């Protein structure tokens, strides 16, 4: 494993390479400019991004001495032994040569000394603090650390001298995903019909540990497909099958359609099967939704050359049983973006401040795996006019709607997150939610007319045997006031 | 088993997991089975016990770290998947989450035929009607 296996983060790679290599390859520059280089790095980011992989690559590539310390590995039952273990580790690292010390999962041995209540924890943290930057000082020892949550670390450790700089190994983009796909499909024998650009395009929120999962699932699909047909031959596997094995594009399509980003595994939606042909009528609405959800994704170049950010939100209102939820299902089914579905009051909790925590967690998972369509069914439940309750319910619903307001348009990075709202009582919505930039478009889904009713009838009877002589026009004419549900 | 790794002393639960994994990888290709894993994966964010955090971190490091594993397979079983640390539900730690849910009528017929294979029945007994009448019975 070398540095050419960590594709997706070139900037972070070079940022690590600077202090990992330059002070050892060309020490003349630093003595010429006078000041010493940084000797402290903290790699942070969401799980499955390449932190441990980068540490492994550094260990394999650099000629310096390497010392691996797992997080909960130093602590022992004996009183006064954890700190002894840390002392011995650093002494061994420093006694031999200019070394590199990698501390994996460091958030478990640095609980701030103030929120923790134990006694060995304080002593271990203080030992680390004094030993990385105390009298005596390190000598040619550079320390690397990796964690999934940096905020749960002692502030005294996030200072120059101890952890000089924090590298952010974050979620890749289309180019990064393509690089990861090339890296992970360099040792397998692919078919001639597979392209990797489309796979990197349709793959949206994948953190790079999911690309390997996709590749492995495709390979397993090929294996089972070609093993279930040809005989098992338990005594011995014939070689005429191995030399012609291949991996087709259809396998990758199957694996892609049967997987989701690891960050959204908790909020995976049940596989519903609706299509644009299942929803009759609403042709203009279908076009509007298709454009509003596809143009920002497929053609970012146009938006960036025009120097304007796309419109995101949209609300549906109308009488019940007209197709709002049906449109939501069709979008969730055959649109090329991740989907997050929440019921109306589903995010409420009895605890104090927990509802806002839920709404913030969901909007953070939405912003991480962008582009993402967040469907808020029955907004009037979760977002109602503030200060309308004469008898207060603890002052919670107001806080919930305030958290929504700040989460849909506040101090954010302006990522591609579209909010679909659906309600049948628009009058009970907070007017600050209907502002453009939060829910720009307000689409009325009216009752079908004669042609719309005929199209709805044809759509509902797509898969149904009928008489050759049956005419549905009379049914459409007879109603004149029905809805799709009727 | 889930709660049996927990220990009195500080820094012994992690030692227990280290010993278990070392024994599993010490000799041969091995299968490990953590029954009721949700009891030792409290998500590391909603929990205040520092021992819980340390054991979760140790499990993460054992499952996927530098020199992660050498031809060893791990299986877990839980009733509350959503109450697991998201860092554990990643490829390389727990990549394929199999859903062993409620059977259908055919599965219930299979279960009935399996369980009534060693006991002696009467001539006037059928399992197709008995399987069909049952609706919600699982396993």
């Amino acid at each position: 494993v070398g540095y050419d296996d960590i594709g997706g983060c070139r900037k972070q790679m070079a940022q690590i390479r600077e202090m990992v290599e330059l002070p050892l390859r060309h020490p003349q520059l630093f003595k010429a400019i006078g000041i010493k280089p940084p000797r402290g790095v903290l790699m942070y980011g969401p799980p499955g991004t390449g932190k441990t992989l980068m540490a492994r690559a550094v260990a394999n590539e650099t000629g310096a001495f390497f010392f691996l310390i797992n997080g909960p590995e130093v602590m022992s039952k004996m009183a006064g032994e954890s700190e002894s273990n840390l002392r011995k580790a650093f002494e061994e690292a420093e006694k031999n040569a200019p070394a590199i010390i990698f501390i994996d999962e460091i958030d478990s041995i640095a609980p701030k000394r103030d929120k923790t209540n134990g006694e060995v924890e304080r002593r271990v943290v203080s030992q680390l603090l004094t030993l990385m930057d105390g009298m005596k000082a390190r000598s040619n020892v550079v320390v690397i650390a990796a964690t999934n949550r940096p905020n749960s670390i002692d502030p005294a450790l996030r200072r120059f001298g101890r952890f000089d700089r924090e590298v952010d190994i974050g979620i890749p983009d289309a180019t990064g995903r393509l690089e990861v796909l090339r890296i992970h499909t360099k040792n397998m024998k692919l078919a001639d019909d597979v392209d990797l650009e489309a796979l990197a395009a349709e793959t949206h929120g994948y953190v790079g540990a999911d690309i390997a999962s996709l590749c492995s699932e495709a390979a397993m699909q090929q294996i089972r497909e070609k093993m279930d047909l040809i005989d098992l031959d338990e005594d011995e596997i014939d070689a005429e099958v191995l030399d012609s094995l291949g991996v087709t594009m259809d396998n990758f399509r199957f694996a892609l359609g049967n997987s989701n980003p690891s960050a959204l595994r908790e909020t995976v939606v049940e596989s519903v099967n609706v299509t644009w042909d299942d929803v009759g009528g609403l042709d203009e609405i279908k076009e509007e939704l298709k454009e509003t959800v596809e143009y920002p994704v497929l053609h970012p170049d146009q938006y960036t050359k025009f120097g304007l950010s796309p419109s995101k939100g949209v609300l549906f209102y109308g009488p019940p049983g007209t197709g709002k939820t049906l449109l939501a299902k069709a979008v969730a089914t055959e649109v090329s973006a991740n989907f997050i579905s929440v019921k109306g009051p589903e995010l409420l909790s009895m605890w104090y401040g927990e509802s806002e925590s839920n709404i913030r967690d969901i909007f953070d998972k939405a912003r991480a795996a962008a582009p993402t369509v967040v469907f808020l069914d029955e907004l009037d439940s979760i977002a109602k006019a503030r200060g309308g309750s004469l008898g207060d319910a603890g002052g919670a619903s107001d806080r919930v709607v305030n958290q929504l307001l700040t989460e849909m348009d506040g101090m954010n990075a302006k990522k591609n997150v579209f909010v679909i709202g659906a309600t049948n009582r628009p009058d009970q919505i907070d007017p600050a939610i209907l502002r453009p930039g939060r829910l720009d478009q307000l689409i009325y889904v009216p009752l079908p007319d004669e042609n719309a009713r005929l199209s709805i009838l044809n759509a509902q009877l797509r898969k149904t045997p009928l008489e050759p002589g049956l005419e549905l026009t009379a049914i459409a004419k007879a109603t004149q006031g029905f809805s799709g549900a009727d | 088993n889930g709660p049996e790794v927990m220990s009195k002393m500080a820094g012994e639960s992690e030692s227990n997991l280290r010993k278990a994994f070392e024994e599993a990888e010490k000799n041969a290709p091995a299968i490990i089975f953590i029954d009721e894993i949700d009891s030792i994966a409290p998500k590391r964010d909603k929990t205040n016990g520092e021992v819980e955090r340390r054991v979760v971190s140790q499990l993460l490091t054992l499952m996927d770290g530098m020199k992660a594993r050498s031809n060893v397979v791990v299986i877990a079983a839980t009733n509350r998947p959503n109450s697991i640390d998201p860092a554990l539900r990643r490829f390389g730690r727990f990549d394929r989450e199999v859903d062993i849910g409620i059977p259908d009528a055919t599965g219930r017929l299979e279960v009935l035929r399996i369980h009534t294979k060693n006991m002696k029945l009467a001539d006037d007994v059928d399992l197709e009607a008995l399987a069909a009448e049952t609706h919600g019975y699982v396993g």
Partner: peptide
Amino acid sequence: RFMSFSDMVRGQADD
């Protein structure tokens, strides 16, 4: 040149 904490602990425990 590479070393892990467990290796060092076991080495010191040997003596």
